[PDB]
């Protein structure tokens, strides 16, 4: 679903941003992550922390972007 998709930092995915994953208002995907273009999909299974892959191809978030997803997908 659309639910998950969240907007990728343009900075970091050209080497260049310099905030913490988790003062980053945008994604920063671990580079294994699939990413189309802008927009990476979240880990559903990881929100639980219910995740257990090794190298994902949806992203983990940090705290904030994982609050941030419970808020959108509150909304129906
Ligand atoms: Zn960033
Ligand atoms: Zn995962």
């Known amino acids: 679903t659309k639910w998950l998709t969240l907007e990728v930092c343009r900075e970091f995915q050209r080497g260049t941003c310099s905030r913490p994953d988790t003062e980053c208002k945008f994604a920063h995907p671990s580079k294994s992550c699939q990413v189309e273009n802008g927009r990476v999909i979240a880990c559903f299974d990881s929100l639980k922390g219910r995740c257990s892959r090794e190298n994902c191809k949806y ?15 509150r909304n129906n």
């Open 59 to 73: 992203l983990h978030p940090p705290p904030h972007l994982k609050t941030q997803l419970e808020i959108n997908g």
